[PDB]
Symmetry: D2
Subunit: 123 residues, 4 copies
């Protein structure tokens, strides 16, 4: 049920856009558009998720990587996100990330709805 | 020159084995075998690297993900590594990692030679 | 102006309570009460902050440590928080933390007002 | 036995010097001299450790903070270290750290002996 839940479009607290297809055998493929930093437009992402998550109602483990080179620019950097997908009406991906240029750390919360402009200003 | 340098087999300070092919447009694909934790044999990895790194002699940014499910076992977890490839006679990948089951953090140093059994015992 | 701004009581997104006095020469002393984990009541904290922060309107760097032993219990663990104090009407301390038992990572946002019960349920 | 083991002088893999007294009730006080970054001479540190660690032979949890202002300079930054003290003939403090200016992450291994000049060059 993780494949159906994960596949689609996600927005983090900054308004960045995470577009992902979850493959049957645990592949993540898609694009990432960061609302911040030395980035513009979409970047290729790839990653992995647990395609047979535990039937005890907990989260699905996943992670992905973006190297910050596209046709617009090259930041000479890469970010990995590591976290858990939880489904339901308020579906979320809770992540910690590492950005290497020298490794910055932080956390991103992704949901299926764009956060309000006021919340984007706050976070 | 990053593609030629990255592609191949890497060992971390724990004796884990990282087998990777760097694709021309920035893809990382391969297998990971962890010497520790709830893991055995090889796991699929995918990731990204900067395929046009800066010509100022610094490192190449990269990252990859392993979800810890294979035909032997499923740990219901995923690790991302984020770091820099530096080439030369003592080529290295310096990484920080995030393991999500609840996110553990650490650091792995990968080289082209297996560390000595005595160093593996130490680290 | 950092001393006046920092000294007082702070609540994170989980409803944990951070009570701190900022000393003139950069000392942080006080108590921490975690709303979660293997903890109850208040624990001694100590830390440091930049007592002469830059006059360019940016944040004040700080960090503190709690070892999770008090008169109620001992979790045999310790957390450090590292982050920035920003003042004003919506004063905040943005932190990343490391909990060592084996090091967990996360992020806590502290403000001068308790988050709503509904937000505490969410975060 | 943690108090006796911790108190003293420690060197990390970079040759930085960590001088600490462990207090009876779990206080850490001392100085830190970083071999790298925007730092020179010694900086005040304070932190906490588990003063009644588990009798099952495992590590002692601890953490400390340095704000990077002294009489020589002010970097407008602060680092926290979080980790475990293990005693014996090859006594060590294994740490992860967070440096906030915007939070960098890494790991430091401290021992009672200075690493060789050749190892300092490597790490
Ligand atoms: O500045 C760079 O080097 C590239 C852009 C990085 C943007 C980071 S990645 C982590 C965080 N989450 C986001 O959606 N954007 C920032
Ligand atoms: O225990 C698990 O959940 C799966 C195995 C995780 C092994 C970790 S990943 C980070 C670190 N580096 C390694 O080579 N192995 C450990
Ligand atoms: O479980 C333990 O070992 C002690 C309690 C730890 C609580 C953590 S510390 C980081 C995070 N922020 C909080 O306010 N509480 C949790
Ligand atoms: O550059 C600064 O802002 C102050 C110096 C920071 C030095 C860091 S702290 C973590 C790491 N471990 C060390 O011994 N030094 C570096
Ligand atoms: Cl797949
Ligand atoms: Cl490619
Ligand atoms: Cl003071
Ligand atoms: Cl004490």
């Amino acid at each position: 049920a993780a494949e159906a839940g994960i596949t689609g479009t996600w927005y983090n607290q900054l308004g960045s856009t995470f577009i992902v297809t979850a493959g049957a055998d645990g592949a993540l493929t898609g694009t990432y558009e960061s609302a911040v930093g030395n980035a513009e437009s979409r970047y290729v992402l790839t990653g992995r998720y647990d395609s047979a998550p535990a039937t005890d109602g907990s989260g699905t483990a996943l992670g992905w990587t973006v190297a910050w080179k596209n046709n617009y620019r090259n930041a000479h950097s890469a970010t990995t996100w590591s976290g858990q997908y939880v489904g339901g009406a308020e579906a979320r991906i809770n992540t910690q990330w590492l950005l290497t240029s020298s490794t910055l750390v932080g956390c991103d919360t992704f949901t299926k709805v764009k956060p309000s402009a006021a919340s984007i200003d706050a976070a």
